[PDB]
Tab-separated table of C-alpha atoms and ligand atoms in Angstrom:
chain	number	residue	atom	x	y	z
O	193	UNK	CA	70.731	97.001	94.694
O	194	UNK	CA	69.399	93.807	95.290
O	195	UNK	CA	66.993	90.953	93.630
O	196	UNK	CA	65.884	87.599	94.326
O	197	UNK	CA	64.867	87.185	90.804
O	198	UNK	CA	67.347	85.674	88.265
O	199	UNK	CA	65.191	87.263	85.892
O	200	UNK	CA	66.061	90.663	86.962
O	201	UNK	CA	69.486	90.545	87.253
O	202	UNK	CA	71.815	92.446	85.336
O	203	UNK	CA	75.128	90.961	84.388
O	204	UNK	CA	76.785	88.336	82.959
O	205	UNK	CA	75.868	84.405	84.168
O	206	UNK	CA	78.397	81.565	84.695
O	207	UNK	CA	77.856	77.994	84.936
O	208	UNK	CA	80.168	76.269	86.760
O	209	UNK	CA	80.963	72.825	88.370
O	210	UNK	CA	83.050	72.159	91.428
O	211	UNK	CA	84.169	68.738	93.469
O	212	UNK	CA	84.634	69.209	96.759
O	213	UNK	CA	88.385	68.473	97.353
O	214	UNK	CA	89.958	67.615	101.056
O	215	UNK	CA	90.620	71.398	101.472
O	216	UNK	CA	86.878	72.246	100.588
O	217	UNK	CA	86.101	74.195	97.266
O	218	UNK	CA	88.426	76.627	98.013
O	219	UNK	CA	86.643	79.626	98.209
O	220	UNK	CA	85.177	82.183	100.757
O	221	UNK	CA	81.582	84.009	100.387
O	222	UNK	CA	80.444	87.106	102.083
O	223	UNK	CA	77.506	88.668	102.717
O	224	UNK	CA	73.822	87.679	103.549
O	225	UNK	CA	73.968	88.578	107.483
O	226	UNK	CA	71.027	90.879	106.311
O	227	UNK	CA	67.447	90.319	104.786
O	228	UNK	CA	67.952	91.446	101.567
O	229	UNK	CA	71.564	90.996	100.381
O	230	UNK	CA	73.416	89.016	97.644
O	231	UNK	CA	76.611	86.700	98.057
O	232	UNK	CA	79.208	87.475	96.636
O	233	UNK	CA	82.736	85.550	96.398
O	234	UNK	CA	85.275	87.084	98.789
O	235	UNK	CA	88.742	85.011	97.974
O	236	UNK	CA	89.962	82.114	96.102
O	237	UNK	CA	92.250	79.619	97.536
O	238	UNK	CA	94.838	79.698	94.741
O	239	UNK	CA	95.469	75.980	95.166
O	240	UNK	CA	91.941	74.858	95.790
O	241	UNK	CA	89.326	73.830	92.960
O	242	UNK	CA	87.583	76.786	93.035
O	243	UNK	CA	90.797	78.670	91.406
O	244	UNK	CA	91.492	76.041	89.566
O	245	UNK	CA	88.416	75.967	87.423
O	246	UNK	CA	89.102	79.947	86.724
O	247	UNK	CA	85.337	80.523	85.933
O	248	UNK	CA	84.176	82.148	89.183
O	249	UNK	CA	85.996	85.769	90.268
O	250	UNK	CA	85.818	87.891	92.609
O	251	UNK	CA	82.620	89.941	93.647
O	252	UNK	CA	80.048	87.507	91.652
O	253	UNK	CA	76.630	87.085	92.693
O	254	UNK	CA	75.910	83.238	93.605
O	255	UNK	CA	72.662	82.631	91.866
O	256	UNK	CA	71.964	79.373	92.722
O	257	UNK	CA	73.627	76.290	94.081
O	258	UNK	CA	72.462	72.570	93.124
O	259	UNK	CA	69.588	73.685	91.060
O	260	UNK	CA	67.984	75.839	93.984
O	261	UNK	CA	67.825	79.446	94.082
O	262	UNK	CA	70.163	80.838	96.726
O	263	UNK	CA	68.964	84.669	96.087
O	264	UNK	CA	68.179	86.082	99.425
O	265	UNK	CA	69.019	83.135	101.749
O	266	UNK	CA	71.037	84.431	104.824
O	267	UNK	CA	74.806	83.824	105.130
O	268	UNK	CA	74.514	80.461	107.367
O	269	UNK	CA	71.909	78.623	104.759
O	270	UNK	CA	74.098	78.718	101.867
O	271	UNK	CA	77.011	77.635	104.132
O	272	UNK	CA	75.140	74.793	105.152
O	273	UNK	CA	75.024	73.729	101.945
O	274	UNK	CA	78.300	73.443	100.670
O	275	UNK	CA	79.373	71.811	104.143
O	276	UNK	CA	76.644	68.941	103.650
O	277	UNK	CA	78.652	68.299	100.175
O	278	UNK	CA	80.879	65.375	101.322
O	279	UNK	CA	84.508	65.305	99.615
O	280	UNK	CA	84.386	63.909	96.171
O	281	UNK	CA	80.970	64.915	95.466
O	282	UNK	CA	80.039	67.746	92.841
O	283	UNK	CA	78.229	71.576	93.355
O	284	UNK	CA	76.865	73.494	90.304
O	285	UNK	CA	76.946	76.569	90.865
O	286	UNK	CA	75.081	79.574	88.395
O	287	UNK	CA	77.320	82.992	89.406
O	288	UNK	CA	76.628	86.661	88.325
O	289	UNK	CA	79.537	89.301	87.233
O	290	UNK	CA	78.384	92.921	87.481
O	291	UNK	CA	78.142	93.877	90.893
O	292	UNK	CA	80.673	95.898	93.055
O	293	UNK	CA	81.117	94.274	96.784
O	294	UNK	CA	77.884	94.647	98.748
O	295	UNK	CA	79.914	96.148	101.822
O	296	UNK	CA	81.654	99.012	100.076
O	297	UNK	CA	78.476	99.209	97.588
O	298	UNK	CA	77.934	103.057	98.060
O	299	UNK	CA	81.365	104.131	98.557
O	300	UNK	CA	83.403	106.016	96.006
O	301	UNK	CA	86.772	104.109	96.396
O	302	UNK	CA	86.637	100.299	95.158
O	303	UNK	CA	89.127	98.032	95.397
O	304	UNK	CA	91.411	98.221	92.607
O	305	UNK	CA	91.157	94.982	90.238
O	306	UNK	CA	95.325	94.111	89.472
O	307	UNK	CA	96.447	94.992	92.820
O	308	UNK	CA	99.871	94.495	93.425
O	309	UNK	CA	101.137	95.596	97.092
O	310	UNK	CA	105.077	94.909	95.995
O	311	UNK	CA	104.628	97.171	92.838
O	312	UNK	CA	102.631	99.957	94.779
O	313	UNK	CA	104.966	99.992	97.657
O	314	UNK	CA	108.356	100.386	95.147
O	315	UNK	CA	106.944	103.122	93.475
O	316	UNK	CA	105.391	104.925	96.471
O	317	UNK	CA	109.458	104.194	97.824
O	318	UNK	CA	110.253	105.733	94.382
O	319	UNK	CA	108.056	108.515	94.652
O	320	UNK	CA	109.494	109.120	98.281
O	321	UNK	CA	112.886	109.591	97.379
O	322	UNK	CA	112.603	111.470	93.647
O	323	UNK	CA	114.396	114.627	93.932
O	324	UNK	CA	111.840	116.797	95.048
O	325	UNK	CA	109.291	113.920	96.359
O	326	UNK	CA	106.501	112.996	93.692
O	327	UNK	CA	103.447	113.565	95.284
O	328	UNK	CA	101.245	112.834	92.541
O	329	UNK	CA	102.112	109.660	92.699
O	330	UNK	CA	101.695	108.755	95.780
O	331	UNK	CA	98.448	110.598	95.577
O	332	UNK	CA	97.534	108.787	92.262
O	333	UNK	CA	98.130	105.077	94.251
O	334	UNK	CA	96.664	105.519	97.206
O	335	UNK	CA	93.052	107.152	96.473
O	336	UNK	CA	92.762	104.484	94.059
O	337	UNK	CA	93.579	102.009	96.659
O	338	UNK	CA	90.733	100.394	99.408
O	339	UNK	CA	91.691	100.545	102.963
O	340	UNK	CA	92.159	96.798	102.741
O	341	UNK	CA	94.924	97.419	99.959
O	342	UNK	CA	96.696	100.052	101.948
O	343	UNK	CA	97.082	98.138	104.897
O	344	UNK	CA	99.322	95.405	102.349
O	345	UNK	CA	100.655	98.319	100.593
O	346	UNK	CA	102.409	99.864	104.155
O	347	UNK	CA	103.149	95.885	104.733
O	348	UNK	CA	105.241	95.746	101.459
O	349	UNK	CA	106.598	98.930	102.036
O	350	UNK	CA	108.025	98.078	105.511
O	351	UNK	CA	109.548	94.679	104.273
O	352	UNK	CA	111.234	96.432	101.704
O	353	UNK	CA	112.431	99.176	103.295
O	354	UNK	CA	112.663	98.257	107.088
O	355	UNK	CA	110.884	101.698	107.786
O	356	UNK	CA	107.258	102.397	108.201
O	357	UNK	CA	105.161	103.537	105.346
O	358	UNK	CA	103.492	106.615	107.480
O	359	UNK	CA	106.891	107.557	109.098
O	360	UNK	CA	108.105	108.044	105.531
O	361	UNK	CA	105.144	109.962	104.131
O	362	UNK	CA	105.137	111.857	107.140
O	363	UNK	CA	109.099	113.241	106.414
O	364	UNK	CA	108.151	113.534	102.806
O	365	UNK	CA	105.022	115.165	102.943
O	366	UNK	CA	103.280	118.446	104.688
O	367	UNK	CA	100.155	120.444	105.043
O	368	UNK	CA	96.678	119.659	104.010
O	369	UNK	CA	98.065	116.958	101.813
O	370	UNK	CA	100.118	114.669	104.779
O	371	UNK	CA	96.793	114.713	107.126
O	372	UNK	CA	94.797	113.255	104.041
O	373	UNK	CA	97.746	110.423	102.977
O	374	UNK	CA	98.426	109.604	106.896
O	375	UNK	CA	94.347	109.631	107.646
O	376	UNK	CA	93.936	107.445	104.447
O	377	UNK	CA	96.801	105.020	106.107
O	378	UNK	CA	94.893	104.529	109.157
O	379	UNK	CA	92.247	101.674	109.511
O	380	UNK	CA	89.020	102.885	110.394
O	381	UNK	CA	89.113	102.627	113.527
O	382	UNK	CA	92.190	103.675	113.926
O	383	UNK	CA	91.769	106.588	112.047
O	384	UNK	CA	88.062	107.211	114.349
O	385	UNK	CA	90.479	106.417	117.386
O	386	UNK	CA	93.175	109.122	116.920
O	387	UNK	CA	90.534	111.654	115.790
O	388	UNK	CA	88.745	111.295	119.240
O	389	UNK	CA	91.979	111.452	120.760
O	390	UNK	CA	92.797	114.413	119.105
O	391	UNK	CA	89.900	115.994	119.915
O	392	UNK	CA	90.323	115.558	123.362
O	393	UNK	CA	93.827	117.217	123.872
O	394	UNK	CA	94.683	119.821	125.999
O	395	UNK	CA	92.202	121.495	128.156
O	396	UNK	CA	89.540	122.682	126.034
O	397	UNK	CA	87.990	120.152	123.900
O	398	UNK	CA	86.802	119.955	120.302
O	399	UNK	CA	83.467	119.528	121.076
O	400	UNK	CA	82.405	119.691	117.174
O	401	UNK	CA	84.820	116.613	116.156
O	402	UNK	CA	83.689	114.314	119.413
O	403	UNK	CA	80.188	115.323	118.176
O	404	UNK	CA	80.236	114.099	114.715
O	405	UNK	CA	82.165	111.046	115.210
O	406	UNK	CA	80.119	109.396	118.041
O	407	UNK	CA	77.412	110.570	116.991
O	408	UNK	CA	77.501	109.244	113.613
O	409	UNK	CA	78.968	105.813	113.817
O	410	UNK	CA	77.512	102.783	114.273
O	411	UNK	CA	77.838	99.898	116.988
O	412	UNK	CA	80.218	97.782	114.686
O	413	UNK	CA	81.898	101.034	114.359
O	414	UNK	CA	81.885	101.803	117.696
O	415	UNK	CA	82.790	98.103	119.422
O	416	UNK	CA	85.860	98.291	117.449
O	417	UNK	CA	86.781	102.009	118.175
O	418	UNK	CA	86.733	101.064	121.695
O	419	UNK	CA	89.071	98.428	121.063
O	420	UNK	CA	91.105	100.457	119.232
O	421	UNK	CA	91.181	103.263	121.107
O	422	UNK	CA	92.279	101.302	124.219
O	423	UNK	CA	94.938	99.509	122.585
O	424	UNK	CA	96.392	102.756	121.005
O	425	UNK	CA	96.359	105.063	124.295
O	426	UNK	CA	96.370	103.004	126.936
O	427	UNK	CA	92.875	104.145	128.351
O	428	UNK	CA	89.188	103.508	127.268
O	429	UNK	CA	87.234	106.225	125.515
O	430	UNK	CA	84.763	106.104	127.570
O	431	UNK	CA	86.984	107.640	130.856
O	432	UNK	CA	88.840	110.036	128.411
O	433	UNK	CA	85.133	111.236	127.497
O	434	UNK	CA	83.969	111.822	131.274
O	435	UNK	CA	87.252	113.745	132.083
O	436	UNK	CA	86.464	116.227	128.847
O	437	UNK	CA	82.605	116.830	129.458
O	438	UNK	CA	80.189	117.323	131.590
O	439	UNK	CA	76.627	117.929	132.040
O	440	UNK	CA	73.931	116.290	130.649
O	441	UNK	CA	76.551	116.532	127.302
O	442	UNK	CA	78.764	113.640	129.119
O	443	UNK	CA	75.559	111.759	129.768
O	444	UNK	CA	74.757	111.807	125.993
O	445	UNK	CA	77.948	111.267	124.454
O	446	UNK	CA	78.981	108.447	126.992
O	447	UNK	CA	75.727	106.711	126.304
O	448	UNK	CA	76.188	106.957	122.622
O	449	UNK	CA	79.846	105.900	123.037
O	450	UNK	CA	79.086	102.770	124.358
O	451	UNK	CA	77.885	101.584	120.896
O	452	UNK	CA	74.723	99.165	122.769
O	453	UNK	CA	71.890	100.930	120.866
O	454	UNK	CA	69.273	98.243	120.188
O	455	UNK	CA	69.352	96.478	116.725
O	456	UNK	CA	66.998	96.938	114.210
O	457	UNK	CA	64.346	94.225	114.740
O	458	UNK	CA	62.535	92.151	112.361
O	459	UNK	CA	58.888	93.764	113.566
O	460	UNK	CA	57.779	96.985	113.956
O	461	UNK	CA	56.463	97.989	117.212
O	462	UNK	CA	53.938	100.849	116.347
O	463	UNK	CA	52.933	100.469	120.038
O	464	UNK	CA	56.389	101.345	121.028
O	465	UNK	CA	56.466	103.883	118.118
O	466	UNK	CA	53.423	106.264	119.754
O	467	UNK	CA	54.657	105.762	123.263
O	468	UNK	CA	57.814	106.846	122.466
O	469	UNK	CA	56.722	109.777	120.533
O	470	UNK	CA	54.638	110.787	123.088
O	471	UNK	CA	57.446	110.712	125.660
O	472	UNK	CA	59.747	112.876	123.370
O	473	UNK	CA	56.667	115.812	123.556
O	474	UNK	CA	55.779	115.405	127.454
O	475	UNK	CA	59.647	115.896	127.958
O	476	UNK	CA	59.720	118.708	126.344
O	477	UNK	CA	58.023	120.988	124.425
O	478	UNK	CA	54.797	120.020	126.406
O	479	UNK	CA	56.315	120.995	129.722
O	480	UNK	CA	58.098	123.806	130.983
O	481	UNK	CA	61.545	122.406	131.295
O	482	UNK	CA	63.269	119.637	129.818
O	483	UNK	CA	63.377	116.243	130.894
O	484	UNK	CA	66.823	115.212	128.990
O	485	UNK	CA	67.535	112.008	130.231
O	486	UNK	CA	63.840	110.744	128.857
O	487	UNK	CA	65.443	112.379	125.288
O	488	UNK	CA	68.560	110.759	125.953
O	489	UNK	CA	67.370	107.243	126.620
O	490	UNK	CA	64.552	107.406	123.899
O	491	UNK	CA	67.375	108.338	121.426
O	492	UNK	CA	70.606	106.485	122.032
O	493	UNK	CA	69.109	103.191	123.300
O	494	UNK	CA	66.078	103.002	120.185
O	495	UNK	CA	67.033	101.152	116.943
O	496	UNK	CA	67.824	103.899	113.812
O	497	UNK	CA	64.653	102.639	111.737
O	498	UNK	CA	62.592	102.631	115.201
O	499	UNK	CA	63.521	106.783	115.877
O	500	UNK	CA	62.830	107.347	112.102
O	501	UNK	CA	59.323	106.270	112.707
O	502	UNK	CA	58.943	108.089	116.210
O	503	UNK	CA	60.370	111.096	114.668
O	504	UNK	CA	57.196	111.411	112.141
O	505	UNK	CA	54.723	110.314	114.912
O	506	UNK	CA	56.160	112.935	117.140
O	507	UNK	CA	54.959	115.212	114.635
O	508	UNK	CA	50.978	114.464	115.541
O	509	UNK	CA	51.779	115.637	118.837
O	510	UNK	CA	53.895	118.276	118.745
O	511	UNK	CA	53.858	121.467	116.102
O	512	UNK	CA	57.323	121.239	115.984
O	513	UNK	CA	59.396	118.600	114.461
O	514	UNK	CA	61.991	116.951	116.289
O	515	UNK	CA	64.988	119.414	114.965
O	516	UNK	CA	62.817	122.396	116.175
O	517	UNK	CA	61.939	121.412	119.095
O	518	UNK	CA	65.660	120.426	120.204
O	519	UNK	CA	66.303	124.286	119.233
O	520	UNK	CA	63.587	125.434	121.283
O	521	UNK	CA	64.105	123.237	124.187
O	522	UNK	CA	67.828	122.902	124.535
O	523	UNK	CA	71.252	124.911	124.074
O	524	UNK	CA	75.231	124.712	124.127
O	525	UNK	CA	77.170	121.280	123.495
O	526	UNK	CA	73.960	119.118	124.008
O	527	UNK	CA	71.897	121.071	121.859
O	528	UNK	CA	74.380	120.667	119.097
O	529	UNK	CA	74.669	116.911	120.089
O	530	UNK	CA	71.209	116.294	119.248
O	531	UNK	CA	70.600	118.258	116.241
O	532	UNK	CA	73.574	116.062	114.998
O	533	UNK	CA	72.219	112.986	116.237
O	534	UNK	CA	68.745	113.332	114.861
O	535	UNK	CA	70.475	114.005	111.777
O	536	UNK	CA	72.191	111.119	111.551
O	537	UNK	CA	69.129	109.068	112.403
O	538	UNK	CA	66.833	110.855	109.966
O	539	UNK	CA	69.113	110.562	106.998
O	540	UNK	CA	73.049	110.314	107.386
O	541	UNK	CA	74.294	111.256	103.969
O	542	UNK	CA	72.356	114.146	104.134
O	543	UNK	CA	74.130	115.122	106.945
O	544	UNK	CA	77.225	114.674	105.832
O	545	UNK	CA	76.461	116.542	103.332
O	546	UNK	CA	75.453	119.594	105.481
O	547	UNK	CA	78.750	119.091	107.030
O	548	UNK	CA	80.401	119.491	103.990
O	549	UNK	CA	78.938	122.342	102.702
O	550	UNK	CA	79.237	123.968	105.965
O	551	UNK	CA	82.923	123.406	105.590
O	552	UNK	CA	83.295	125.036	103.009
O	553	UNK	CA	80.297	127.553	102.390
O	554	UNK	CA	82.241	130.813	103.638
O	555	UNK	CA	85.772	131.991	103.832
O	556	UNK	CA	88.445	129.497	103.305
O	557	UNK	CA	87.979	126.083	104.798
O	558	UNK	CA	87.007	124.124	107.628
O	559	UNK	CA	89.959	121.558	106.477
O	560	UNK	CA	89.508	119.096	109.432
O	561	UNK	CA	86.159	118.434	108.928
O	562	UNK	CA	86.202	118.368	105.205
O	563	UNK	CA	89.728	116.095	105.208
O	564	UNK	CA	87.546	113.257	107.535
O	565	UNK	CA	84.521	112.966	106.013
O	566	UNK	CA	86.376	112.582	102.385
O	567	UNK	CA	88.690	109.787	103.892
O	568	UNK	CA	86.034	108.115	106.559
O	569	UNK	CA	83.223	108.073	104.457
O	570	UNK	CA	84.893	107.440	101.182
O	571	UNK	CA	84.295	103.529	101.954
O	572	UNK	CA	81.108	103.592	103.249
O	573	UNK	CA	78.487	106.044	101.518
O	574	UNK	CA	79.922	108.718	99.509
O	575	UNK	CA	77.771	107.692	96.561
O	576	UNK	CA	74.639	108.558	98.994
O	577	UNK	CA	76.410	111.664	99.973
O	578	UNK	CA	77.205	113.028	96.818
O	579	UNK	CA	73.681	112.462	95.408
O	580	UNK	CA	72.395	114.456	98.508
O	581	UNK	CA	74.634	117.188	97.850
O	582	UNK	CA	73.497	117.639	94.574
O	583	UNK	CA	70.032	117.454	95.135
O	584	UNK	CA	70.089	119.971	98.057
O	585	UNK	CA	72.631	122.514	96.530
O	586	UNK	CA	72.543	121.934	92.574
O	587	UNK	CA	75.767	121.983	92.065
O	588	UNK	CA	78.208	118.362	92.704
O	589	UNK	CA	80.315	118.010	95.971
O	590	UNK	CA	83.228	118.170	93.674
O	591	UNK	CA	82.519	121.221	92.134
O	592	UNK	CA	82.582	122.753	95.710
O	593	UNK	CA	86.140	120.638	96.661
O	594	UNK	CA	87.461	122.163	93.456
O	595	UNK	CA	86.488	125.837	94.490
O	596	UNK	CA	87.920	125.800	98.123
O	597	UNK	CA	90.887	123.632	97.425
O	598	UNK	CA	93.936	123.406	95.314
O	599	UNK	CA	97.149	121.295	94.535
O	600	UNK	CA	97.975	117.899	95.188
O	601	UNK	CA	95.410	118.340	98.089
O	602	UNK	CA	92.522	119.263	95.944
O	603	UNK	CA	93.802	116.185	93.760
O	604	UNK	CA	93.262	113.876	96.641
O	605	UNK	CA	90.324	115.196	97.772
O	606	UNK	CA	88.655	114.759	94.158
O	607	UNK	CA	90.209	111.583	93.671
O	608	UNK	CA	88.124	110.603	97.270
O	609	UNK	CA	85.292	112.050	96.110
O	610	UNK	CA	85.214	109.769	92.567
O	611	UNK	CA	83.937	112.111	90.230
O	612	UNK	CA	81.466	114.978	89.117
O	613	UNK	CA	77.838	114.857	89.566
Y	99	LIG	CA1	106.987	117.690	94.667
Y	100	LIG	CA1	106.170	116.926	108.135
Y	101	LIG	CA1	90.381	118.579	125.886
Y	102	LIG	CA1	60.904	125.256	127.432
Y	103	LIG	CA1	85.122	128.478	101.183
């Protein structure tokens, strides 16, 4: 939720007067790198003038600066205002509290307010070394902390025990719960890199997990994954993909994995929307055979909002929509990859909602899929996933998880889910 009107903000307003000392006002701001996005306080230097006042907290939307509304201004416009203020002069800030964090706006797992990594690390150490292992405690803590907070916890645990938290939980847990907790302990890029590597272990590759991750991750996420993957495994992700795929499926996975998709522009390119749509039709349903490189080129290179509009314009040219045309034109891992891809383009939360439903709908559970989605999307779009799940399937994601999993494993997944619908 965003609004550049002070008359449409619902939270409480806070007026504050700050004098810029030698180390700045003493706070970090986040947001504003988008068209419509707020500007919220990230951290406060506990020895700076911002924390001295004590009336500014993390998550406060900056409504105005020096009698000028900064709601809707970019990140560089309001940073230049505070930096132009010399040392010793005053600034006036009207803030707004009641909004989350912008980044984790649609996640189910939020940063824990009264966070204390040392107290958490001790409590996890005490749970581990309790006779029979206190898994409930380990679960209650790690699933109600942000990934950032789980990194501080593992650092404090390592400082206290001289042992790695991940090693200790490995030896204390087992089964699906172990998979969940260890997954949560990795950073988003670390987790995705290790899931990618596992999908390519052995001679046979897990094309479903490879497709799910490569097709759903953004440019920014794929950039970091490529970086951390070479760090962890001493090889480029691209090479491992080249080694474990072939044909047009390899072409599509390599192109997507680069994370070089064009960024969403400011202008809608209507001529290109129509031309791209025409090109997708001519390359497939219109003709005998398929020009797959043309599909690959358009679907990996255009920005997502652009491709959403070409898929709608594509319906003007083809009697089948993009998904139907994929099933008609192409088969195998290539068909699966294209289907996963344009689902992620069209409605990514619905894509994950359907993947979750498929993992539980029948006999047993595809736990690797369920666990990976619950872990990797809990701080991204889990609230949207739950809204699409409930709308389409008529019962909550929570309800399905509860039916399909049991034990502390279930409790961990339910916490990552964040509640019923
Ligand atoms: Ca136990
Ligand atoms: Ca074990
Ligand atoms: Ca393999
Ligand atoms: Ca055909
Ligand atoms: Ca089931």
